[PDB]
Amino acid sequence: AAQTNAPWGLARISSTSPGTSTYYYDESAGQGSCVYVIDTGIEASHPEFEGRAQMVKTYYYSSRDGNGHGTHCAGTVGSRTYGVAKKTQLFGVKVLDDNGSGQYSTIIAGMDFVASDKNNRNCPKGVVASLSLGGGYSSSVNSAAARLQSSGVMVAVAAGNNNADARNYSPASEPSVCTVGASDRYDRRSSFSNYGSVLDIFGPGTSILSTWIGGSTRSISGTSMATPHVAGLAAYLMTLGKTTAASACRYIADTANKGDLSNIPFGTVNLLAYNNYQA
Ligand SMILES: [Ca+2]
């Protein structure tokens, strides 16, 4: 399949070179997979989600996304126009309030929730979790992310936006999950992107167009935006039968565009998520 004039990030993920604008992907498009977006929620009624999105959990007085961040992230995972996996099922878990904040205890609870909750969902091709959030190092937070992964969910987490080594952030620093740095449309490491040995992969994170609340759209930047590209990619590859929750991060790294990014600090991987789709 080919989607012309796609957001640059989508085109980038299906290209061996920067500077193109068409997104190429197998029509299966993540059908039969599920992606949990653990964030400020998801505006499920957005036309862009086509009935494929649902809120399944909140720790606040509403499950509505009163911020937009979670809806943007979900849009990158699987919206019809702005999504990597255009046929995946999206499940929203609201661990962040409408200011985008959340206590670590609530974040942990949301991760453990998804590990159980996947047994209540129909996801024959497999399960992914996208965590576009983080804070300072916490062994408890890292352990929760490790549990979620161990339970059979492909966990993708943001490296963080401090232009700093991600070893000092959680869940970014957890070895067993897929930690995602951010790049721009010229294949530069995004100026704010964290880096370090704990990173597994980069995806598009600068000036990313996606869904927003009020049934709108916007371009924003962050490792928050890179993460759902990787989460969507994993879902898409799982439906194709190329990989599984346990091996998807390795598989993406194995099949990544290699050595193409600039300003990657010595010791950080130079790998950019790529779907290896031959139209
Ligand atoms: Ca890892």
From Swiss-Prot:
Cofactor binding summary note: Binds 2 calcium ions per subunit.
The first-level EC class reads hydrolase
Disulphide bridges, residue numbers:
C34-C123, C178-C249
Hey, which family's this protein in? Belongs to the peptidase S8 family.
EC assignment: the record states: 3.4.21.64
In this protein, the active site sits at: D39, H69, S224
* Cofactor(s) the record lists: Ca(2+)
Instruction: List this protein's GO terms for biological process.
Output: proteolysis
Q: Which UniProt keywords apply?
A: Calcium, Disulfide bond, Hydrolase, Metal-binding, Protease, Serine protease, Signal, Zymogen
At the top level, the lineage of the source is: Eukaryota
Q: Which residues of the full protein are shown?
A: 106 to 384 of 384
Q: Does the keyword Calcium apply?
A: yes
Q: Where along this sequence does the record place binding of Ca(2+) 2? A: T16, D260
Which amino acids does the record list as binding Ca(2+) 1?
P175, V177, D200
Q: Which reaction is catalysed here?
A: Hydrolysis of keratin, and of other proteins with subtilisin-like specificity. Hydrolyzes peptide amides
The Swiss-Prot or TrEMBL record annotates one GO molecular function as: serine-type endopeptidase activity
Keyword Acyltransferase attached: no
Q: Which GO terms describe its cellular component?
A: extracellular region
List the protein's name: Proteinase K
Domain Peptidase S8, residue spans: 7-279
Q: What does this protein do?
A: Hydrolyzes keratin at aromatic and hydrophobic residues.
